[PDB]
Amino acid sequence: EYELPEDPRWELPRDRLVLGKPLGEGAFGQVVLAEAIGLPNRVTKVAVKMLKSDATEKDLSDLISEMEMMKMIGKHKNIINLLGACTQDGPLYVIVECASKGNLREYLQARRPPEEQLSSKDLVSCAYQVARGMEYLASKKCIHRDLAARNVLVTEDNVMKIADFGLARDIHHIDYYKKTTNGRLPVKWMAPEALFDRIYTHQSDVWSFGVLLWEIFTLGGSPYPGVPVEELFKLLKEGHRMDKPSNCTNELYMMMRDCWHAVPSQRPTFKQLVEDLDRIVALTSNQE
Numbered sequence: 001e002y003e004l005p006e007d008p009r010w011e012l013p014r015d016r017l018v019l020g021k022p023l024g025e026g027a028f029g030q031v032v033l034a035e036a037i038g039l040p041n042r043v044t045k046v047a048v049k050m051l052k053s054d055a056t057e058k059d060l061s062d063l064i065s066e067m068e069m070m071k072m073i074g075k076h077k078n079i080i081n082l083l084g085a086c087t088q089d090g091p092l093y094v095i096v097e098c099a100s101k102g103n104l105r106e107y108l109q110a111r112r113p114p115e116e117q118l119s120s121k122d123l124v125s126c127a128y129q130v131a132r133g134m135e136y137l138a139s140k141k142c143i144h145r146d147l148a149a150r151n152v153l154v155t156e157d158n159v160m161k162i163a164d165f166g167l168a169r170d171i172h173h174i175d176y177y178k179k180t181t182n183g184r185l186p187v188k189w190m191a192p193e194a195l196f197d198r199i200y201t202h203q204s205d206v207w208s209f210g211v212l213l214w215e216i217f218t219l220g221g222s223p224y225p226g227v228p229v230e231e232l233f234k235l236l237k238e239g240h241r242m243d244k245p246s247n248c249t250n251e252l253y254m255m256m257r258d259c260w261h262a263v264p265s266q267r268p269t270f271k272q273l274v275e276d277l278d279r280i281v282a283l284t285s286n287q288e
């Protein structure tokens with residue numbers, strides 16, 4: 001861990017990083033808030049990923065892989081960008097953009113009606129920005145595999161930023177019954193070919209994006225509440241599709257249903273979703 005080669009254009013001297021509050025423990029790393037001086041005399045709030053106290057040699061390898069993948073993908077306004085690393089004279093820190101308004105599920109839930117209310121235009125605009133993020137990632141051949149409002153973060157200026165996109169495919173033993181911190185099952189966002197045949201593509205991320213649209217328009221609603229894994233598989237095998245949320249146009253509902261085509265080749269692309277959402281935003285009212 002203290003024997004890592006430097007990548008000089010990314011390297012930040014450790015003493016320029018003021019560590020702050022821990023956000024607790026992830027799968028192979030952990031995240032702490034911090035402030036970074038420079039990136040000259042200016043502080044930027046950042047989030048930092050580092051190793052757990054009890055950390056395997058594979059954890060270290062995974063943390064490095066995620067960093068290097070972030071470098072290869074490059075920057076975009078609608079993703080959480082790599083800003084820096086500390087690789088020398090101490091523990092590995094991977095330093096990213098900090099999004100101050102939490103994840104999109106929380107952002108949306110906090111702005112449900114009885115401060116800050118979201119207009120219909122604001123909701124379509126979150127969708128647009130996520131789609132744009134995902135279009136960028138798709139153009140870099142990055143398949144997300146867990147696209148969901150939980151993995152979108154919102155900046156101080158209400159920008160949407162896709163998170164957690166730099167993970168290499170797990171040599172798949174994915175545990176279907178594992179829940180999120182908030183008690184929900186990630187299997188509920190997965191395309192059926194992903195769930196049943198373990199095939200993940202841009203097309204399967206477009207299915208996940210449809211569930212994300214439904215989350216946006218339910219203001220952080222929970223898909224399939226109270227449905228366990230076995231019953232979810234049966235709903236999918238039957239061709240069940242979630243109901244149209246209230247306060248969602250027929251057009252946005254058709255976009256969801258199109259994202260949820262049984263035939264992956266027949267779903268829209270993110271390129272097509274970006275275009276449609278661009279047109280829809282312009283036509284959607286900000287008056288309520």
Ligand SMILES: */C=C\C(=O)Nc1ccccc1Nc1cc(N(CCCN2CCN(C)CC2)C(=O)Nc2c(Cl)c(OC)cc(OC)c2Cl)ncn1
Nearest residue numbers: 023025026045047048049080094097098099100163164165
């Ligand atoms: C900028 C102000 C601020 O304090 N923001 C803030 C406070 C509290 C909670 C979240 C945030 N915003 C934020 C967080 C992150 N994280 C942490 C997201 C929440 N954790 C998920 C993991 N769980 C184990 C703890 C809770 C984040 O992980 N960022 C992140 C890192 Cl560190 C990363 O390292 C390589 C790679 C990615 O994505 C590729 C991300 Cl998203 N990030 C930004 N703002």
